[PDB]
Protein backbone atom coordinates (compact mmCIF):
# COMPACT_ATOMS: atom_id res chain seq x y z
CA UNK A 1 0.00 0.00 0.00
CA UNK A 2 3.14 2.31 -0.36
CA UNK A 3 1.71 3.46 -3.73
CA UNK A 4 -1.71 4.25 -2.23
CA UNK A 5 0.17 6.20 0.48
CA UNK A 6 2.01 8.09 -2.22
CA UNK A 7 -1.09 8.66 -4.32
CA UNK A 8 -2.66 10.06 -1.13
CA UNK A 9 0.25 12.32 -0.18
CA UNK A 10 0.65 13.56 -3.80
CA UNK A 11 -2.93 14.59 -4.02
CA UNK A 12 -2.74 15.94 -0.42
CA UNK A 13 0.08 18.23 -1.52
CA UNK A 14 -2.15 19.56 -4.37
CA UNK A 15 -4.67 20.39 -1.71
CA UNK A 16 -2.00 22.07 0.37
CA UNK A 17 -1.24 24.28 -2.64
CA UNK A 18 -4.89 25.31 -2.91
CA UNK A 19 -4.92 26.10 0.80
CA UNK A 20 -1.96 28.41 0.20
CA UNK A 21 -3.50 30.12 -2.83
CA UNK A 22 -6.58 30.80 -0.76
CA UNK A 23 -4.58 31.54 2.44
CA UNK A 24 -7.32 29.41 4.10
CA UNK A 25 -6.43 27.85 7.45
CA UNK A 26 -9.77 26.06 7.74
CA UNK A 27 -8.64 24.18 4.58
CA UNK A 28 -5.05 23.80 5.89
CA UNK A 29 -6.57 22.31 9.05
CA UNK A 30 -7.76 19.34 6.98
CA UNK A 31 -4.15 18.64 5.85
CA UNK A 32 -2.02 19.45 8.86
CA UNK A 33 -2.10 17.60 12.13
CA UNK A 34 -4.05 19.71 14.60
CA UNK A 35 -1.63 19.66 17.52
CA UNK A 36 0.99 21.73 19.40
CA UNK A 37 3.70 19.48 18.04
CA UNK A 38 3.08 20.29 14.40
CA UNK A 39 5.71 22.75 13.19
CA UNK A 40 6.61 24.86 10.15
CA UNK A 41 10.13 26.27 9.53
CA UNK A 42 10.23 29.01 6.88
CA UNK A 43 12.51 31.84 5.83
CA UNK A 44 10.66 34.36 8.04
CA UNK A 45 10.44 32.31 11.22
CA UNK A 46 9.33 29.11 12.85
CA UNK A 47 5.75 28.20 13.58
CA UNK A 48 5.34 26.02 16.65
CA UNK A 49 1.99 24.23 16.76
CA UNK A 50 -1.01 24.34 14.45
CA UNK A 51 -2.26 27.52 16.08
CA UNK A 52 0.88 29.39 15.08
CA UNK A 53 0.69 27.95 11.57
CA UNK A 54 -3.00 29.01 11.21
CA UNK A 55 -2.38 32.45 12.67
CA UNK A 56 1.06 33.66 11.62
CA UNK A 57 1.60 31.57 8.44
CA UNK A 58 -1.80 31.25 6.76
CA UNK A 59 -3.18 34.38 8.28
CA UNK A 60 -0.29 36.82 8.26
CA UNK A 61 2.42 35.57 5.99
CA UNK A 62 0.09 34.41 3.23
CA UNK A 63 -3.27 36.19 3.78
CA UNK A 64 -2.45 39.68 5.05
CA UNK A 65 0.71 40.11 3.00
CA UNK A 66 -0.70 39.18 -0.46
CA UNK A 67 -3.99 39.74 -2.26
CA UNK A 68 -3.45 36.99 -4.87
CA UNK A 69 -1.20 33.88 -4.58
CA UNK A 70 -0.26 31.00 -6.87
CA UNK A 71 1.97 28.23 -5.50
CA UNK A 72 2.97 25.48 -7.95
CA UNK A 73 5.39 22.49 -8.02
CA UNK A 74 8.16 22.27 -10.64
CA UNK A 75 7.86 18.44 -10.84
CA UNK A 76 5.85 15.89 -8.97
CA UNK A 77 7.06 15.33 -5.43
CA UNK A 78 9.62 12.73 -4.24
CA UNK A 79 7.89 10.75 -1.47
CA UNK A 80 9.80 8.28 0.71
CA UNK A 81 7.57 6.11 2.87
CA UNK A 82 8.84 4.72 6.21
CA UNK A 83 5.95 2.71 7.69
CA UNK A 84 3.49 5.24 9.09
CA UNK A 85 5.53 8.33 8.32
CA UNK A 86 6.65 9.74 5.00
CA UNK A 87 8.96 12.49 3.77
CA UNK A 88 7.89 14.50 0.71
CA UNK A 89 10.31 16.88 -1.04
CA UNK A 90 9.62 19.27 -3.86
CA UNK A 91 10.69 22.29 -5.76
CA UNK A 92 8.14 25.07 -5.98
CA UNK A 93 7.47 28.51 -7.35
CA UNK A 94 5.25 31.23 -6.02
CA UNK A 95 3.60 34.30 -7.55
CA UNK A 96 1.85 36.70 -5.32
CA UNK A 97 0.50 40.22 -5.50
CA UNK A 98 1.49 42.25 -2.38
CA UNK A 99 -1.15 44.26 -0.43
CA UNK A 100 1.40 46.96 0.61
CA UNK A 101 2.39 48.21 -2.92
CA UNK A 102 0.28 46.14 -5.39
CA UNK A 103 3.38 44.71 -7.05
CA UNK A 104 3.71 41.07 -8.20
CA UNK A 105 6.48 39.25 -6.31
CA UNK A 106 7.95 36.00 -7.59
CA UNK A 107 9.85 33.47 -5.55
CA UNK A 108 11.09 29.87 -5.69
CA UNK A 109 12.63 27.25 -3.44
CA UNK A 110 12.67 23.77 -1.99
CA UNK A 111 10.24 22.31 0.49
CA UNK A 112 10.16 19.21 2.67
CA UNK A 113 7.05 17.95 4.45
CA UNK A 114 6.81 15.13 6.95
CA UNK A 115 3.48 13.29 6.75
CA UNK A 116 2.46 10.83 9.46
CA UNK A 117 -0.57 8.53 9.49
CA UNK A 118 -2.59 9.91 12.33
CA UNK A 119 -4.82 7.18 13.83
CA UNK A 120 -8.47 7.23 12.52
CA UNK A 121 -7.83 10.58 10.75
CA UNK A 122 -5.41 9.58 8.02
CA UNK A 123 -2.24 11.03 6.67
CA UNK A 124 -1.47 14.59 7.86
CA UNK A 125 1.43 17.07 7.77
CA UNK A 126 3.43 17.01 10.93
CA UNK A 127 6.23 19.28 9.78
CA UNK A 128 7.24 21.56 6.96
CA UNK A 129 10.59 23.19 6.25
CA UNK A 130 10.90 25.45 3.26
CA UNK A 131 13.81 27.47 1.97
CA UNK A 132 14.83 29.40 -1.08
CA UNK A 133 16.64 28.08 -4.14
CA UNK A 134 20.19 26.78 -4.01
CA UNK A 135 23.01 29.36 -4.12
CA UNK A 136 26.36 28.11 -5.29
CA UNK A 137 28.52 31.28 -5.22
CA UNK A 138 31.90 31.32 -3.43
CA UNK A 139 31.36 31.64 0.31
CA UNK A 140 27.54 31.49 0.21
CA UNK A 141 24.98 29.03 1.56
CA UNK A 142 26.85 27.62 4.59
CA UNK B 1 9.68 4.27 25.17
CA UNK B 2 9.17 7.79 23.53
CA UNK B 3 11.74 9.15 26.04
CA UNK B 4 14.29 6.44 25.19
CA UNK B 5 13.69 7.31 21.51
CA UNK B 6 14.34 10.95 22.32
CA UNK B 7 17.36 10.21 24.48
CA UNK B 8 18.66 8.18 21.50
CA UNK B 9 17.98 10.84 18.86
CA UNK B 10 19.40 13.63 21.10
CA UNK B 11 22.63 11.82 21.58
CA UNK B 12 22.57 10.78 17.88
CA UNK B 13 22.45 14.45 16.93
CA UNK B 14 25.57 15.09 19.11
CA UNK B 15 27.25 12.40 17.08
CA UNK B 16 26.07 14.02 13.88
CA UNK B 17 27.76 17.23 15.02
CA UNK B 18 31.05 15.40 15.56
CA UNK B 19 30.74 13.85 12.11
CA UNK B 20 30.41 17.37 10.71
CA UNK B 21 33.36 18.77 12.67
CA UNK B 22 35.46 15.94 11.35
CA UNK B 23 33.84 16.02 7.86
CA UNK B 24 33.89 12.19 8.25
CA UNK B 25 31.42 10.27 6.10
CA UNK B 26 32.43 6.91 7.58
CA UNK B 27 31.11 8.36 10.87
CA UNK B 28 28.07 9.94 9.16
CA UNK B 29 27.34 6.50 7.69
CA UNK B 30 26.63 5.24 11.22
CA UNK B 31 23.92 7.94 11.66
CA UNK B 32 22.30 8.24 8.26
CA UNK B 33 20.31 5.55 6.56
CA UNK B 34 22.53 4.01 3.89
CA UNK B 35 20.14 4.12 0.95
CA UNK B 36 19.30 5.99 -2.29
CA UNK B 37 16.20 7.41 -0.63
CA UNK B 38 18.05 9.29 2.08
CA UNK B 39 18.19 12.97 1.18
CA UNK B 40 19.73 16.25 2.37
CA UNK B 41 18.41 19.70 1.31
CA UNK B 42 20.84 22.54 2.05
CA UNK B 43 21.45 26.11 0.90
CA UNK B 44 23.93 24.99 -1.79
CA UNK B 45 21.93 22.13 -3.28
CA UNK B 46 20.12 18.89 -2.70
CA UNK B 47 21.80 15.59 -1.99
CA UNK B 48 19.87 12.59 -3.28
CA UNK B 49 20.93 9.33 -1.65
CA UNK B 50 23.63 8.54 0.89
CA UNK B 51 26.29 8.47 -1.80
CA UNK B 52 25.63 12.09 -2.69
CA UNK B 53 25.60 13.04 0.99
CA UNK B 54 28.96 11.26 1.60
CA UNK B 55 30.54 12.68 -1.54
CA UNK B 56 29.24 16.20 -2.11
CA UNK B 57 28.19 17.15 1.46
CA UNK B 58 30.71 15.54 3.81
CA UNK B 59 33.44 15.40 1.26
CA UNK B 60 33.12 18.64 -0.67
CA UNK B 61 30.93 21.04 1.21
CA UNK B 62 32.39 20.28 4.63
CA UNK B 63 35.80 18.60 4.03
CA UNK B 64 37.33 20.29 0.99
CA UNK B 65 35.91 23.74 1.71
CA UNK B 66 37.07 24.09 5.36
CA UNK B 67 40.15 23.06 7.32
CA UNK B 68 38.50 23.38 10.77
CA UNK B 69 34.75 23.18 11.62
CA UNK B 70 32.68 23.54 14.78
CA UNK B 71 28.92 22.93 14.56
CA UNK B 72 26.93 23.48 17.77
CA UNK B 73 23.23 23.64 18.81
CA UNK B 74 21.77 26.79 20.43
CA UNK B 75 19.41 24.72 22.65
CA UNK B 76 18.62 21.07 22.91
CA UNK B 77 16.57 19.77 20.01
CA UNK B 78 12.73 19.57 19.78
CA UNK B 79 11.92 15.94 18.94
CA UNK B 80 8.41 14.85 17.98
CA UNK B 81 7.95 11.09 17.87
CA UNK B 82 5.34 9.51 15.54
CA UNK B 83 5.61 5.74 16.05
CA UNK B 84 8.72 4.62 14.16
CA UNK B 85 9.60 8.00 12.72
CA UNK B 86 10.57 11.21 14.44
CA UNK B 87 11.15 14.84 13.48
CA UNK B 88 13.98 16.73 15.20
CA UNK B 89 14.35 20.51 14.83
CA UNK B 90 17.12 22.73 16.08
CA UNK B 91 18.90 25.99 15.81
CA UNK B 92 22.61 25.78 15.15
CA UNK B 93 25.74 27.80 14.65
CA UNK B 94 28.83 26.98 12.67
CA UNK B 95 32.42 28.22 12.71
CA UNK B 96 34.75 27.09 10.04
CA UNK B 97 38.13 28.07 8.69
CA UNK B 98 38.11 28.16 4.83
CA UNK B 99 40.84 26.38 2.81
CA UNK B 100 40.69 28.96 -0.05
CA UNK B 101 41.68 32.11 1.96
CA UNK B 102 42.31 30.89 5.57
CA UNK B 103 39.58 33.14 6.95
CA UNK B 104 37.13 32.10 9.70
CA UNK B 105 33.53 32.08 8.44
CA UNK B 106 30.60 32.09 10.84
CA UNK B 107 27.08 31.03 10.03
CA UNK B 108 23.79 30.11 11.72
CA UNK B 109 20.40 28.65 10.87
CA UNK B 110 17.65 26.15 11.48
CA UNK B 111 17.75 22.44 10.78
CA UNK B 112 15.18 19.67 10.61
CA UNK B 113 16.04 15.98 10.54
CA UNK B 114 13.69 13.07 10.01
CA UNK B 115 14.77 9.95 11.90
CA UNK B 116 13.17 6.58 11.19
CA UNK B 117 13.67 3.32 13.08
CA UNK B 118 15.34 1.17 10.51
CA UNK B 119 14.67 -2.53 11.21
CA UNK B 120 17.53 -4.32 13.12
CA UNK B 121 19.80 -1.25 12.69
CA UNK B 122 18.08 1.32 14.88
CA UNK B 123 17.21 4.92 14.49
CA UNK B 124 18.82 6.66 11.49
CA UNK B 125 18.54 9.96 9.58
CA UNK B 126 16.37 9.65 6.55
CA UNK B 127 16.27 13.33 5.66
CA UNK B 128 17.78 16.65 6.55
CA UNK B 129 16.75 20.14 5.50
CA UNK B 130 18.79 23.06 6.71
CA UNK B 131 18.47 26.76 6.04
CA UNK B 132 19.80 30.03 7.30
CA UNK B 133 18.37 32.18 10.07
CA UNK B 134 14.99 33.87 9.81
CA UNK B 135 14.83 37.19 7.90
CA UNK B 136 11.94 39.45 8.73
CA UNK B 137 12.60 42.51 6.51
CA UNK B 138 9.88 43.92 4.22
CA UNK B 139 9.59 41.77 1.11
CA UNK B 140 12.15 39.13 2.17
CA UNK B 141 11.91 35.41 2.94
CA UNK B 142 8.95 34.39 0.75
Amino acid sequence: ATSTVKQEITEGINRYLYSIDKADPTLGKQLFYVSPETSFIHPRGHERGWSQIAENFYGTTMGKTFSKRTLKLDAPPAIHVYGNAAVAEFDWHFTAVRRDNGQTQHTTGRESQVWAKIPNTGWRIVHVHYSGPAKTGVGEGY
Side-chain angles (χ1 to χ4, degrees), chain A residues 1-67 69-142:
Chain A
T2 280
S3 59
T4 304
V5 169
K6 278 176 188 191
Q7 163 198 359
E8 178 168 353
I9 294 170
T10 293
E11 172 56 27
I13 290 174
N14 290 341
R15 286 197 278 138
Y16 165 77
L17 299 181
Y18 188 75
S19 77
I20 297 295
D21 289 7
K22 304 285 139 169
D24 195 338
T26 70
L27 286 175
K29 204 182 167 151
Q30 303 193 337
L31 300 166
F32 281 82
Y33 181 42
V34 175
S35 156
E37 303 230 72
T38 299
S39 61
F40 196 121
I41 296 172
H42 58 100
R44 290 179 70 78
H46 187 157
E47 312 309 327
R48 298 177 181 87
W50 166 253
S51 289
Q52 288 182 15
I53 294 173
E55 172 63 28
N56 194 63
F57 191 73
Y58 277 94
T60 297
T61 304
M62 292 295 101
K64 293 172 163 59
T65 300
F66 302 106
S67 56
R69 295 162 299 275
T70 303
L71 183 71
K72 298 223 129 70
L73 307 187
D74 294 327
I79 299 166
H80 306 300
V81 179
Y82 301 99
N84 290 307
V87 175
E89 325 170 61
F90 53 86
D91 299 289
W92 54 268
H93 58 265
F94 183 63
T95 309
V97 187
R98 302 204 217 173
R99 291 199 202 269
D100 56 27
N101 66 9
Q103 286 178 359
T104 294
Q105 161 161 36
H106 186 89
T107 61
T108 69
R110 285 82 47 86
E111 184 155 328
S112 1
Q113 302 196 333
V114 179
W115 294 65
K117 182 169 165 44
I118 293 304
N120 306 296
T121 312
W123 286 93
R124 298 285 187 280
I125 306 165
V126 295
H127 176 73
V128 178
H129 187 153
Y130 85 74
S131 56
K135 293 172 305 219
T136 74
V138 179
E140 32 166 29
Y142 305 96

